[PDB]
Every structure is written in C-alpha cells, then in structure tokens.
Coordinates of C-alpha atoms in Angstrom, one line a residue:
Chain A
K1 CA -23.0 5.2 12.3
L2 CA -19.8 6.0 10.6
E3 CA -19.8 2.6 9.0
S4 CA -23.0 3.3 7.2
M5 CA -22.3 7.0 6.6
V6 CA -19.1 6.4 4.6
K7 CA -21.0 4.1 2.2
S8 CA -22.0 6.5 -0.5
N9 CA -21.9 7.1 -4.3
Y10 CA -18.2 6.8 -4.9
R11 CA -18.0 3.5 -3.0
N12 CA -21.1 2.3 -4.9
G13 CA -19.4 3.3 -8.2
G14 CA -20.5 6.9 -8.9
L15 CA -16.9 8.2 -8.4
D16 CA -16.5 9.3 -12.1
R17 CA -19.9 11.2 -11.8
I18 CA -18.7 12.9 -8.6
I19 CA -15.4 13.9 -10.2
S20 CA -17.4 15.2 -13.3
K21 CA -19.3 17.5 -10.8
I22 CA -15.9 19.0 -9.8
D23 CA -14.8 21.5 -12.3
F24 CA -11.3 23.0 -12.3
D25 CA -9.0 24.7 -14.8
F26 CA -5.4 23.7 -15.2
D27 CA -2.4 25.3 -16.9
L28 CA -1.9 22.3 -19.3
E29 CA 0.8 22.6 -22.0
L30 CA -1.2 20.1 -24.2
Chain B
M1 CA 6.9 25.0 21.7
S2 CA 10.2 25.4 19.8
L3 CA 9.7 25.9 16.0
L4 CA 10.8 22.9 13.8
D5 CA 12.9 24.4 11.0
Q6 CA 16.5 24.4 9.8
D7 CA 17.3 27.2 12.2
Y8 CA 16.4 24.9 15.2
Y9 CA 19.1 22.5 14.4
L10 CA 21.4 25.4 13.4
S11 CA 21.0 26.9 16.9
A12 CA 21.5 23.4 18.4
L13 CA 24.8 23.2 16.7
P14 CA 27.8 25.5 17.5
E15 CA 28.2 28.7 15.5
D16 CA 31.3 27.1 13.7
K17 CA 28.8 24.7 12.1
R18 CA 26.3 27.5 11.5
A19 CA 28.2 30.2 9.7
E20 CA 31.4 28.6 8.2
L21 CA 29.7 25.7 6.5
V22 CA 27.3 27.9 4.4
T23 CA 29.9 30.5 3.4
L24 CA 29.3 31.8 -0.2
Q25 CA 32.7 33.7 -0.2
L26 CA 36.0 31.9 -0.7
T27 CA 39.3 33.3 0.6
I28 CA 42.2 32.5 -1.6
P29 CA 45.8 33.4 -0.6
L30 CA 48.1 34.8 -3.4
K31 CA 51.5 33.5 -4.3
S32 CA 53.0 37.0 -3.5
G33 CA 52.6 36.2 0.1
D34 CA 50.1 37.6 2.7
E35 CA 47.8 39.0 0.0
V36 CA 44.5 37.2 -0.3
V37 CA 41.5 37.5 -2.6
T38 CA 37.8 37.0 -1.6
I39 CA 35.3 36.0 -4.4
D40 CA 31.7 35.8 -3.6
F41 CA 29.9 32.9 -5.3
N42 CA 26.6 34.8 -5.4
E43 CA 27.9 36.7 -8.4
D44 CA 28.5 34.9 -11.8
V45 CA 31.8 33.3 -11.1
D46 CA 33.7 32.3 -14.3
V47 CA 35.2 28.9 -14.2
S48 CA 38.2 29.6 -16.5
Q49 CA 39.3 32.9 -14.9
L50 CA 39.0 31.3 -11.3
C51 CA 41.0 28.2 -12.3
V52 CA 43.7 30.3 -14.0
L53 CA 44.0 32.5 -10.9
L54 CA 44.1 29.5 -8.6
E55 CA 46.8 27.8 -10.7
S56 CA 48.8 31.1 -10.8
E57 CA 48.7 31.6 -7.1
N58 CA 49.0 27.8 -6.4
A59 CA 46.4 27.8 -3.6
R60 CA 45.6 24.8 -1.4
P61 CA 43.6 22.0 -3.0
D62 CA 40.8 22.5 -0.4
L63 CA 39.9 25.8 -2.1
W64 CA 39.8 24.0 -5.6
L65 CA 37.5 21.3 -4.3
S66 CA 35.4 23.7 -2.4
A67 CA 34.8 25.8 -5.5
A68 CA 34.0 22.5 -7.3
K69 CA 31.4 21.7 -4.6
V70 CA 29.8 25.2 -4.9
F71 CA 29.7 24.9 -8.8
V72 CA 28.0 21.5 -8.2
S73 CA 25.5 23.3 -6.0
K74 CA 25.2 25.8 -9.0
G75 CA 24.5 22.8 -11.3
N76 CA 27.8 23.5 -13.4
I77 CA 28.8 19.9 -13.7
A78 CA 31.0 20.7 -16.8
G79 CA 32.5 23.6 -14.9
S80 CA 33.1 21.4 -11.9
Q81 CA 34.8 18.8 -14.2
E82 CA 37.0 21.6 -15.7
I83 CA 37.9 22.7 -12.1
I84 CA 38.8 19.1 -11.2
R85 CA 40.8 18.6 -14.4
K86 CA 42.8 21.8 -14.1
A87 CA 43.4 21.0 -10.4
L88 CA 45.0 17.8 -11.6
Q89 CA 47.1 20.0 -13.9
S90 CA 48.0 22.3 -11.1
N91 CA 51.5 22.2 -9.4
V92 CA 50.2 21.8 -5.9
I93 CA 48.5 18.4 -6.5
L94 CA 51.3 17.1 -8.6
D95 CA 53.8 18.0 -5.8
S96 CA 51.4 16.7 -3.1
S97 CA 51.0 13.1 -2.1
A98 CA 48.8 10.5 -3.9
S99 CA 46.1 11.1 -1.3
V100 CA 45.1 14.5 -2.7
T101 CA 45.0 13.0 -6.3
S102 CA 42.9 10.1 -5.1
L103 CA 40.5 12.5 -3.4
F104 CA 40.1 14.5 -6.6
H105 CA 39.7 11.3 -8.6
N106 CA 36.8 10.4 -6.2
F107 CA 35.4 13.8 -6.6
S108 CA 35.4 13.2 -10.4
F109 CA 33.6 9.9 -9.6
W110 CA 31.0 11.8 -7.7
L111 CA 30.7 14.3 -10.6
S112 CA 30.0 11.4 -13.0
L113 CA 27.4 10.0 -10.5
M114 CA 25.8 13.5 -10.3
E115 CA 25.7 13.8 -14.1
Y116 CA 24.0 10.4 -14.3
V117 CA 21.5 11.3 -11.6
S118 CA 20.7 14.7 -13.2
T119 CA 20.2 13.2 -16.7
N120 CA 19.1 9.6 -16.1
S121 CA 20.8 8.7 -19.5
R122 CA 24.1 7.5 -20.9
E123 CA 24.4 5.2 -17.8
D124 CA 27.1 2.9 -19.2
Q125 CA 29.5 5.6 -20.3
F126 CA 29.3 7.6 -17.1
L127 CA 29.5 4.4 -15.1
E128 CA 32.7 3.4 -16.9
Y129 CA 34.3 6.9 -16.4
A130 CA 33.3 6.8 -12.7
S131 CA 34.7 3.3 -12.4
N132 CA 38.1 4.3 -14.0
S133 CA 38.3 7.4 -11.7
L134 CA 37.5 5.3 -8.6
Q135 CA 40.0 2.6 -9.7
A136 CA 42.7 5.3 -10.1
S137 CA 41.8 6.7 -6.7
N138 CA 42.0 3.3 -5.1
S139 CA 45.4 2.5 -6.8
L140 CA 46.8 5.8 -5.6
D141 CA 45.4 5.6 -2.1
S142 CA 43.6 2.5 -1.0
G143 CA 43.4 3.5 2.7
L144 CA 40.5 6.1 2.1
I145 CA 37.2 4.9 3.3
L146 CA 35.5 7.2 0.8
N147 CA 36.9 4.9 -1.9
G148 CA 35.1 2.0 -0.2
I149 CA 31.9 4.1 -0.1
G150 CA 32.3 4.8 -3.8
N151 CA 32.8 1.1 -4.5
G152 CA 29.6 0.2 -2.6
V153 CA 27.7 2.9 -4.5
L154 CA 29.1 1.5 -7.8
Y155 CA 28.0 -2.0 -6.8
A156 CA 24.6 -0.7 -5.8
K157 CA 24.1 1.0 -9.2
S158 CA 25.2 -2.2 -11.0
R159 CA 22.9 -4.2 -8.7
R160 CA 25.9 -6.0 -7.1
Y161 CA 24.1 -5.8 -3.7
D162 CA 26.2 -8.5 -2.0
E163 CA 29.5 -6.9 -2.6
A164 CA 28.2 -3.4 -1.5
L165 CA 26.8 -5.0 1.7
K166 CA 30.2 -6.6 2.3
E167 CA 31.9 -3.2 1.8
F168 CA 29.4 -1.5 4.3
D169 CA 30.1 -4.4 6.7
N170 CA 33.8 -3.6 6.5
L171 CA 33.1 0.1 7.0
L172 CA 30.9 -0.6 10.0
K173 CA 33.8 -2.7 11.4
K174 CA 36.0 0.3 10.9
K175 CA 33.6 2.7 12.5
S176 CA 29.9 2.8 13.4
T177 CA 29.5 6.5 13.0
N178 CA 29.6 6.6 9.2
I179 CA 26.3 8.2 8.2
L180 CA 26.8 7.6 4.5
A181 CA 27.4 3.8 5.1
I182 CA 24.2 3.6 7.0
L183 CA 22.3 5.4 4.2
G184 CA 23.8 3.2 1.5
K185 CA 23.0 0.0 3.5
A186 CA 19.3 1.2 4.1
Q187 CA 19.1 2.0 0.4
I188 CA 20.3 -1.5 -0.5
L189 CA 17.9 -3.2 2.0
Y190 CA 15.0 -1.1 0.7
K191 CA 16.0 -2.3 -2.8
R192 CA 15.9 -5.8 -1.4
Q193 CA 12.5 -5.0 0.2
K194 CA 13.8 -5.2 3.7
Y195 CA 11.7 -2.2 4.9
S196 CA 12.0 -2.7 8.6
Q197 CA 15.8 -3.0 8.7
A198 CA 16.1 0.0 6.5
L199 CA 13.6 1.8 8.8
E200 CA 15.9 1.2 11.8
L201 CA 18.9 2.4 9.7
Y202 CA 16.9 5.5 8.8
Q203 CA 15.9 6.2 12.4
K204 CA 19.6 5.8 13.4
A205 CA 20.7 8.2 10.6
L206 CA 18.1 10.8 11.7
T207 CA 19.2 10.5 15.3
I208 CA 22.9 10.9 14.3
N209 CA 22.3 13.7 11.9
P210 CA 19.0 15.5 11.4
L211 CA 20.7 17.8 8.8
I212 CA 22.2 15.0 6.5
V213 CA 21.7 15.0 2.8
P214 CA 19.9 12.9 1.4
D215 CA 17.0 13.3 3.8
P216 CA 16.3 10.2 5.9
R217 CA 12.7 11.4 6.6
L218 CA 11.8 10.5 3.0
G219 CA 12.7 6.9 3.7
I220 CA 10.9 7.0 7.1
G221 CA 7.8 8.2 5.3
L222 CA 8.1 5.5 2.7
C223 CA 8.5 2.8 5.5
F224 CA 5.4 4.2 7.3
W225 CA 3.6 4.0 4.0
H226 CA 4.7 0.4 3.8
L227 CA 3.5 -0.1 7.4
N228 CA 0.2 1.8 6.7
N229 CA 1.1 4.6 9.2
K230 CA 0.7 7.1 6.5
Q231 CA -0.3 9.9 9.1
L232 CA 3.2 9.8 10.5
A233 CA 4.6 9.6 6.9
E234 CA 2.8 12.9 6.1
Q235 CA 3.9 14.5 9.4
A236 CA 7.6 13.5 8.7
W237 CA 7.2 14.8 5.1
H238 CA 5.9 18.2 6.3
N239 CA 9.0 18.3 8.7
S240 CA 11.2 17.5 5.7
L241 CA 9.6 20.4 3.8
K242 CA 10.2 22.6 6.7
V243 CA 13.9 21.6 6.9
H244 CA 14.3 21.5 3.0
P245 CA 12.0 24.0 1.4
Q246 CA 14.0 24.1 -1.8
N247 CA 14.7 21.5 -4.5
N248 CA 12.5 19.0 -2.8
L249 CA 9.4 18.7 -5.0
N250 CA 9.3 14.9 -4.5
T251 CA 8.1 15.4 -1.0
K252 CA 5.3 17.6 -2.2
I253 CA 4.4 14.8 -4.7
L254 CA 4.3 12.2 -2.0
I255 CA 2.2 14.5 0.2
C256 CA -0.3 14.9 -2.7
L257 CA -0.4 11.2 -3.3
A258 CA -1.0 10.6 0.5
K259 CA -3.8 13.2 0.5
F260 CA -5.4 11.6 -2.6
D261 CA -5.3 8.2 -0.7
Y262 CA -6.8 9.8 2.4
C263 CA -9.6 11.4 0.3
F264 CA -10.3 8.0 -1.4
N265 CA -10.3 5.9 1.7
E266 CA -11.5 8.2 4.5
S267 CA -14.1 10.6 3.1
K268 CA -17.3 10.1 5.2
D269 CA -19.6 11.9 2.8
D270 CA -19.8 13.2 -0.8
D271 CA -19.3 16.9 0.2
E272 CA -16.2 16.0 2.2
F273 CA -14.9 13.9 -0.8
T274 CA -15.5 16.9 -3.1
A275 CA -13.7 19.3 -0.7
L276 CA -10.7 17.0 -0.2
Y277 CA -10.5 16.1 -3.9
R278 CA -10.5 19.8 -4.8
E279 CA -8.0 20.6 -2.2
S280 CA -5.7 17.8 -3.6
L281 CA -6.2 19.2 -7.1
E282 CA -5.4 22.7 -6.0
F283 CA -2.2 21.5 -4.2
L284 CA -1.2 19.5 -7.2
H285 CA -1.7 22.5 -9.5
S286 CA 0.3 24.7 -7.1
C287 CA 3.2 22.1 -7.3
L288 CA 2.7 22.2 -11.0
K289 CA 3.5 25.9 -11.2
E290 CA 7.1 25.1 -10.3
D291 CA 7.6 22.1 -12.7
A292 CA 5.0 21.7 -15.4
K293 CA 6.8 18.8 -17.3
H294 CA 7.1 16.3 -14.5
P295 CA 5.8 12.9 -15.9
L296 CA 4.4 11.6 -12.7
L297 CA 2.2 14.7 -12.2
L298 CA 0.8 14.3 -15.8
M299 CA 0.1 10.6 -15.1
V300 CA -1.8 11.5 -11.9
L301 CA -3.7 14.3 -13.7
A302 CA -4.6 11.8 -16.4
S303 CA -6.8 9.9 -14.0
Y304 CA -8.7 13.1 -13.2
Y305 CA -9.1 14.0 -16.8
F306 CA -10.2 10.5 -17.7
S307 CA -12.9 10.8 -15.0
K308 CA -13.8 14.2 -16.7
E309 CA -14.3 12.4 -20.1
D310 CA -11.3 14.4 -21.5
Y311 CA -9.9 11.3 -23.3
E312 CA -8.0 13.3 -26.0
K313 CA -5.9 15.2 -23.5
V314 CA -5.3 11.9 -21.6
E315 CA -3.9 10.5 -24.9
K316 CA -1.7 13.5 -25.5
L317 CA -0.2 13.3 -22.0
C318 CA 0.3 9.6 -22.3
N319 CA 2.0 9.9 -25.6
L320 CA 4.2 12.7 -24.2
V321 CA 5.1 10.5 -21.1
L322 CA 5.9 7.5 -23.5
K323 CA 8.2 9.7 -25.6
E324 CA 10.1 11.3 -22.7
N325 CA 10.1 8.5 -20.0
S326 CA 10.3 5.3 -22.2
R327 CA 13.2 4.2 -20.0
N328 CA 10.8 3.8 -17.0
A329 CA 8.7 0.7 -17.5
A330 CA 6.1 1.8 -14.9
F331 CA 5.1 4.9 -16.8
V332 CA 4.9 2.9 -20.0
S333 CA 2.6 0.4 -18.2
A334 CA 0.5 3.3 -16.8
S335 CA 0.2 5.0 -20.2
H336 CA -0.8 1.7 -21.9
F337 CA -3.4 1.1 -19.1
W338 CA -4.9 4.6 -19.7
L339 CA -4.9 4.2 -23.5
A340 CA -6.7 0.8 -23.0
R341 CA -9.2 2.5 -20.6
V342 CA -9.8 5.3 -23.3
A343 CA -10.2 2.7 -26.1
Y344 CA -12.7 0.7 -23.8
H345 CA -15.3 3.6 -24.3
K346 CA -14.6 3.3 -28.0
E347 CA -15.0 -0.6 -27.5
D348 CA -11.7 -1.2 -29.3
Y349 CA -11.5 -4.6 -27.5
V350 CA -8.6 -6.0 -29.5
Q351 CA -6.6 -2.7 -29.2
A352 CA -7.4 -2.4 -25.5
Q353 CA -6.4 -6.0 -24.9
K354 CA -3.2 -5.4 -26.7
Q355 CA -2.5 -2.3 -24.7
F356 CA -3.2 -4.2 -21.5
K357 CA -0.8 -6.9 -22.5
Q358 CA 1.9 -4.4 -23.3
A359 CA 1.3 -2.8 -19.9
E360 CA 1.6 -6.2 -18.2
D361 CA 4.9 -6.9 -20.1
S362 CA 6.2 -3.5 -19.1
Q363 CA 5.4 -3.7 -15.4
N364 CA 4.1 -7.1 -13.9
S365 CA 3.0 -5.3 -10.6
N366 CA 0.1 -3.5 -12.4
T367 CA -2.7 -5.7 -11.2
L368 CA -5.3 -3.3 -12.7
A369 CA -3.8 -3.9 -16.2
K370 CA -4.1 -7.7 -15.8
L371 CA -7.7 -7.3 -14.5
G372 CA -8.6 -5.1 -17.4
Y373 CA -7.0 -7.7 -19.7
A374 CA -9.3 -10.3 -18.3
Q375 CA -12.2 -7.9 -18.7
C376 CA -11.3 -7.4 -22.4
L377 CA -11.1 -11.2 -22.7
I378 CA -14.7 -11.2 -21.4
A379 CA -15.6 -8.5 -23.9
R380 CA -14.4 -10.6 -26.8
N381 CA -16.5 -13.5 -25.5
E382 CA -13.4 -15.5 -24.7
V383 CA -14.8 -17.1 -21.6
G384 CA -12.4 -20.0 -21.5
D385 CA -9.3 -18.0 -22.1
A386 CA -10.3 -15.5 -19.4
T387 CA -11.0 -18.3 -17.0
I388 CA -7.5 -19.9 -17.7
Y389 CA -5.8 -16.5 -17.3
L390 CA -7.6 -15.8 -14.0
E391 CA -6.7 -19.2 -12.7
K392 CA -3.1 -18.7 -13.6
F393 CA -3.1 -15.2 -12.0
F394 CA -4.8 -16.6 -8.8
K395 CA -2.3 -19.5 -8.4
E396 CA 0.6 -17.1 -9.0
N397 CA -0.8 -14.5 -6.6
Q398 CA -2.7 -16.5 -3.9
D399 CA -1.8 -13.8 -1.3
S400 CA -3.1 -10.8 -3.4
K401 CA -6.2 -9.1 -2.1
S402 CA -8.0 -8.7 -5.4
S403 CA -11.6 -8.8 -4.2
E404 CA -13.1 -8.1 -7.6
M405 CA -11.0 -10.8 -9.2
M406 CA -12.4 -13.3 -6.7
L407 CA -16.0 -12.0 -7.3
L408 CA -15.5 -12.5 -11.0
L409 CA -14.1 -16.0 -10.4
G410 CA -17.1 -16.8 -8.3
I411 CA -19.5 -15.5 -11.0
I412 CA -17.7 -17.5 -13.7
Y413 CA -17.6 -20.7 -11.7
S414 CA -21.3 -20.3 -11.0
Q415 CA -21.9 -20.0 -14.7
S416 CA -19.7 -23.2 -15.1
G417 CA -21.5 -24.9 -12.3
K418 CA -19.1 -27.8 -11.7
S419 CA -16.7 -25.5 -9.8
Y420 CA -19.3 -24.4 -7.2
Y421 CA -17.0 -25.0 -4.2
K422 CA -14.4 -22.6 -5.6
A423 CA -17.1 -20.1 -6.2
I424 CA -18.2 -20.4 -2.5
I425 CA -14.6 -19.9 -1.3
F426 CA -14.0 -16.9 -3.6
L427 CA -17.3 -15.2 -2.7
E428 CA -16.7 -15.7 1.0
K429 CA -13.2 -14.2 0.6
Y430 CA -14.7 -11.3 -1.3
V431 CA -17.3 -10.8 1.5
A432 CA -14.5 -10.9 4.1
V433 CA -12.3 -8.4 2.2
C434 CA -15.2 -6.1 1.7
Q435 CA -16.1 -6.2 5.4
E436 CA -12.4 -5.6 6.4
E437 CA -12.3 -2.6 4.0
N438 CA -15.8 -1.2 5.1
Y439 CA -17.0 -1.2 1.5
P440 CA -20.7 -1.9 0.3
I441 CA -21.1 -5.6 -0.3
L442 CA -22.6 -6.3 -3.7
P443 CA -26.0 -8.2 -3.2
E444 CA -25.3 -10.0 -6.5
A445 CA -22.7 -12.1 -4.7
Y446 CA -25.3 -13.0 -2.1
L447 CA -27.7 -14.0 -4.9
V448 CA -25.1 -16.2 -6.5
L449 CA -24.2 -17.8 -3.2
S450 CA -27.9 -18.5 -2.6
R451 CA -28.2 -20.1 -6.1
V452 CA -25.2 -22.3 -5.4
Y453 CA -26.3 -23.3 -1.9
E454 CA -29.8 -24.2 -3.3
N455 CA -28.4 -27.7 -4.0
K456 CA -26.4 -27.8 -0.8
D457 CA -28.0 -25.9 2.1
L458 CA -31.3 -24.1 2.0
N459 CA -30.7 -22.5 5.3
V460 CA -27.5 -20.7 4.2
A461 CA -29.1 -19.7 0.9
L462 CA -32.1 -18.2 2.8
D463 CA -29.8 -16.4 5.2
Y464 CA -27.8 -14.9 2.3
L465 CA -31.0 -13.9 0.5
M466 CA -32.2 -12.2 3.7
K467 CA -28.9 -10.3 4.0
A468 CA -29.2 -9.3 0.3
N469 CA -32.8 -8.1 0.9
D470 CA -31.6 -6.1 3.9
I471 CA -28.8 -4.5 1.9
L472 CA -31.2 -3.6 -1.0
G473 CA -33.9 -2.2 1.3
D474 CA -36.4 -0.6 -1.1
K475 CA -34.5 -2.0 -4.1
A476 CA -36.0 -5.5 -3.5
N477 CA -37.3 -7.1 -6.7
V478 CA -40.0 -9.7 -7.5
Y479 CA -37.6 -12.6 -7.9
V480 CA -36.0 -12.1 -4.5
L481 CA -39.3 -11.9 -2.7
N482 CA -40.6 -15.0 -4.6
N483 CA -37.5 -17.0 -3.7
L484 CA -37.9 -15.9 -0.1
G485 CA -41.5 -17.0 -0.1
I486 CA -40.6 -20.4 -1.6
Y487 CA -37.8 -20.8 1.0
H488 CA -40.3 -20.3 3.8
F489 CA -42.7 -22.6 2.1
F490 CA -40.1 -25.3 2.2
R491 CA -39.3 -24.3 5.7
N492 CA -43.0 -24.7 6.6
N493 CA -43.1 -21.0 7.7
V494 CA -46.6 -20.5 6.3
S495 CA -47.0 -17.0 7.8
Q496 CA -43.7 -15.7 6.6
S497 CA -44.2 -17.3 3.2
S498 CA -47.6 -15.7 2.9
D499 CA -46.1 -12.3 3.9
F500 CA -43.3 -12.6 1.3
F501 CA -45.8 -13.7 -1.4
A502 CA -48.0 -10.6 -0.6
Chain C
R1 CA -16.9 1.6 -12.8
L2 CA -15.6 -1.7 -11.6
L3 CA -12.1 -0.8 -12.9
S4 CA -12.6 2.7 -11.4
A5 CA -13.2 1.0 -8.0
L6 CA -10.1 -1.2 -8.5
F7 CA -8.1 1.9 -9.4
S8 CA -9.4 3.6 -6.2
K9 CA -8.4 0.6 -4.1
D10 CA -4.9 0.3 -5.7
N11 CA -4.5 4.1 -5.9
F12 CA -0.8 4.8 -6.6
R13 CA 0.9 1.8 -4.9
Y14 CA 3.2 0.6 -7.8
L15 CA 4.0 4.3 -8.8
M16 CA 6.2 4.9 -5.7
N17 CA 9.1 2.9 -7.3
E18 CA 10.3 6.0 -9.3
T19 CA 9.9 8.2 -6.1
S20 CA 13.1 6.5 -4.6
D21 CA 15.2 9.3 -6.1
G22 CA 15.8 10.5 -2.5
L23 CA 17.6 7.2 -1.6
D24 CA 20.6 8.0 -3.7
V25 CA 23.6 9.2 -1.6
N26 CA 26.2 11.7 -2.9
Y27 CA 29.2 13.2 -1.0
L28 CA 29.1 16.6 -2.7
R29 CA 25.6 17.4 -1.6
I30 CA 26.5 18.2 2.0
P31 CA 27.8 21.7 2.2
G32 CA 30.1 21.4 5.2
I33 CA 31.4 17.8 4.8
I34 CA 34.0 18.9 2.2
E35 CA 35.2 22.4 3.2
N36 CA 38.3 20.8 4.8
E37 CA 39.7 17.4 4.0
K38 CA 38.9 16.2 7.6
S39 CA 35.5 18.0 7.7
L40 CA 33.8 14.6 7.6
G41 CA 35.3 13.7 10.9
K42 CA 34.6 17.2 12.3
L43 CA 31.0 16.8 11.4
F44 CA 30.8 13.3 12.7
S45 CA 32.2 14.5 16.1
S46 CA 30.0 17.6 16.1
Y47 CA 26.9 15.6 16.7
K48 CA 28.3 13.6 19.5
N49 CA 27.7 16.7 21.7
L50 CA 24.0 16.4 20.6
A51 CA 21.8 13.5 21.5
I52 CA 18.0 12.4 21.6
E53 CA 17.4 15.3 24.0
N54 CA 18.6 17.9 21.6
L55 CA 16.3 16.5 18.9
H56 CA 13.0 18.4 18.3
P57 CA 10.0 16.9 20.1
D58 CA 8.1 16.3 16.8
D59 CA 11.1 14.5 15.4
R60 CA 11.3 12.5 18.7
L61 CA 7.7 11.5 18.1
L62 CA 8.7 10.2 14.7
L63 CA 10.9 7.6 16.5
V64 CA 8.3 4.9 17.0
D65 CA 9.3 1.4 18.0
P66 CA 8.3 -1.1 15.2
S67 CA 10.6 4.9 29.2
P68 CA 13.1 3.7 31.8
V69 CA 11.8 1.9 34.9
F70 CA 13.3 2.4 38.4
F71 CA 13.9 -1.3 39.1
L72 CA 16.3 -2.1 36.1
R73 CA 19.8 -1.0 37.2
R74 CA 22.9 -0.9 35.0
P75 CA 25.4 -3.5 36.3
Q76 CA 28.6 -2.5 38.1
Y77 CA 31.8 -4.2 39.1
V78 CA 33.4 -2.4 42.0
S79 CA 30.1 -1.4 43.9
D80 CA 30.7 1.0 46.9
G81 CA 31.1 1.0 50.7

C-alpha cells in the first residue's frame, strides 16, 4: 500500500502550495 | 562499539604520529650553541621578527618550512611567501645543496596553488608563477618525485590530462604507495567521468590512509551519488564530519542536498514531507550561521523562496550570485533559470525565453532551462519552432529520461496527427518512466493514447480509457463515460454500454 | 507546476560540479608530511603496520565491492614432508 500512499499532493503538483504552508524565518542579508 | 572519530585513528597510530605531528610549538637552536628558543604558534607570531631571528641563528631549513606550513594553516599566504623568500636569502639554503632550494621552490609552487584555490581568481598569473617555480625546482633537482607530482597537478589545472596521467603512471612505476599520486589520478578520472575507477582509487587511498588530506570520503560519497547509493554517501559524509569537524562546510552542503533529495523522493505522506522539509531548512539555516555569503546556499534557498512567492528576494539573491560568481557558468545558468521562472508569473514570455537561452548557453546540462525554453516557445504560440527544438533536443539526447518532454511531444504529435506513431512511442515511454519512478500517471496521456488508437485498435483505446477511469475514480467526466459506452456499443457489450450510458 | 515537478525530479544534479573543491590535492595541507624532509616516507611506512583490521568497522562497511573460503589455498613451491 506504500505505492498508493506515496502518491499525494506534491507528486500531483501541489508542491508549491505545500511549501507555502511551511513558514520559517531566515537571517537573510538581502 | 569503538567510537569513530579522529581520536580512534590517533590511538591506532603510535604516539610519535599522535603528538609530534600536531605540535604548535617550534624549537629553534641558536647560533651561540646549545641555546634554543621555543615559540608557540598559538600566540600571534610575527613573520618579520621570526624570519630575522631564524636568519640570524641560521637554523635548519626544516624549521623554516615548518613555520611556513603553520602560517599556511593560519591562512597567512603572504607571510608564508615572505618566509620562503627570506629562506632563499638565508645562508643555510645558499650553502646547502640544490635539493633544499628545489624543495623551497616547490613549496612556493604550492603557495601559488593555495592562493589560486583560496581566491579562484588571477588564474593565469599564479599559474605562471607556479610554473616558473616548479621549473626552477626541476632544473635544480629533477630526482624529486614531488616535482613530478607538481607537474601532474599543473597539467591537471591546465586540462592536460594525458601528460598528468603519464606522470602518475611513472610515479606508480616508481612506487605504488604514493597517496598523492592516487588522489591526483582519481581526480583526473573523475574529471574524465570515470567514476568507478576513481572509486576504486578512493577506496585504496582510504585503506592506505584514513587521515589523509584531502578527504577521500567526499569522493566516495560523490561516487555513491553517481551509483544511486546515496545512503552510504550520507553515512560516509557523517564519518567525514566526525573526522574533520572544522573547515569542511562542503560536506554539510552535500548532506543538506542529499536530505532534500530524500525528502523529495521518499516522503510517504504530506506530514512527513513537511517535517523532513522543515528539518532540511533548519539544517541549512544552521549551516548558514557559519557562512552567510556562500552562493550555492543562496541558490538552494532561492527555490524555497520562489515556492514562497518571494520573487523579489529571489531576484536580489540571483543578481548577487551573478555579480560574485560570474566565473562559474552553472550559477549563471541557475540564476537565469530562476529569473525566467519569476518572469513567467509576470508573463514576460520574450524576457523569460531570452533568460532560458542565456541559461542554456551558460550551461548545456540544465535540462530544466531547455524545457522552460520550449514552454516559452509554446507560450508565444510558436508551435513549429517548439516542435523543431524538441525534436533536436530529443535526437541529441535520446538517452535522457525526460518524461515530461516525451509527454509534450506526444501531445504535440497528436495535435499534428500525422506523427501518431511517434506520439504512441513517447507516451508509452512516459508511462514506463512514471511506473519506474512510482509517480502518478497523468490520465490525459491515456486519453490521448485512446484518441490515437481510435483509428488503429479499439481494444487498446478501450483498455487505456478504462485505466484512465480507474485512475480518476470519482473524477470521471461525461466525455469519458460516453466514449466507454460507445466503445462497448461497438464491442456489442449491450449491458456494459447501457451501464456506462446510465 | 510541471516545471516544479521537473525541478523536483532533477533536484540538484548539475549543481554538484562546483562541489568538487575537495578533489584538489595540496602537499602543505597535511600537518605531519612536512615536519622533516623525509616525513613523507615516514608517514607512508607508518601505515604499513596498520591494515584493514585496524580500520573502523563503519569505514570497513564503506568498502563495498562495485569472505575467504576454506577450499582456495594459496600456492606453494617447496611443500612439506
């Protein structure tokens, strides 16, 4: 069932939306 | 079990190789006789005063070159050059044989090489200085194998791989225990993409010397990455970090990239993906607290910030990387790719296509840049130009596993119609690649295959449509059900056609 | 999102070319190879006392072929008796 479980939003193309749900603050110089 | 650290291979070695090799205090006899002076290198040692004292007491050249090595470890390349130059002016080396002068000339050659490595600029000037020093060393003493090693390294930097390989063959004929010869040979073979031969050479170097600088385990991890055994690569990189916890941030960078790859290709669920991605971001930020101006880290973070709709900061980092690392073409290609991706949201199709072309010209290995270039050609409605470009790319790269390129080729050929067989081949290859990668097969490819097979084989079209319906599940549309009903009607399956029509 | 999936597939394959900075070999980096003029030979003969057995087990696990058997003897010339 691991073959069907691994198929999810990021594989379908919602990777950008998933990353957008992850918020983190960096020490950027720019 | 026994702890894997530097202290393990220290305790394996005798105490002579433990304590003496890492001494930070240098003992210098005086010219007055039995009097000696001990100077600790932990304190701020002045180059000029130490050189004047050494010249006055006329100490052995071993102390001069050891002080030069320590100042190399301190990063004082100019100070080490001053030490070497004043050593050549010292009475001892002038009264010694030409072997000592040749050794110090080779040390100056290594100083020029280290300056080139630490700056990655003024390559021609430092190479000429190093070549002159090495030529002087060879003329004064041609029997030193270190001169041959330096010649091989000089050929390798100038991409004269054949002559360097011949020099390393001569060195191997002289003796098979030369670790530096094995490392240089493996570096050349890796440069010639002979990963397996370099992997055996790296393993041999690791077995001979686990405490040799440069670290063979980095090359072993690179070879494991080339052989897809990235788990062993990460394990060897962790062992390398244990052995070398300082001045080895590149190992941490490779570990972060491997962790990102594992998160991308192994996360079984969205929550696990989020956890692994956040862990990779935290590890990358922790590595950034030591060096905050490393261009590769900014390039990696640009992907995350592009996914965060922070296009402005992506542009700032890309321009900064272009300004600093314009010598490296890969960073120029990556920055142009990210600028084109940013401009794609703005729909600057001409500007994005030009940026993709510049990225392609900078680094031809960027397949994503060429695919984005084809996408921009589609965006400007240049169907024929995109088709010709895609055919050229496919014929040049028939072994490349670009599944989306083949899917796009199949869709384009289906739109053309006359090239239906090429569409069948490309869509079947796309299906096979997706099955091998365990990725969700797009049902649109199955619909296109069914449309193509309508004029060839109704059975194959019906089977592909059934597979597409099973993939969609509840996402089945009216067109798919109607075509299934018509297929069963032509198949004289009255009951199944009636059910599909219902 | 198609280009995002392509980026995920490719990841950072072609960005590993710059990461070859560890391949460069320099004589002055090793601390104990230079302390005496013949320290290179001393270090080369210091590891002949060591072998695969002295290696750490995890590093032994890193030596993967890209056990002896009782019925393969090493040839001799004088025998015994």
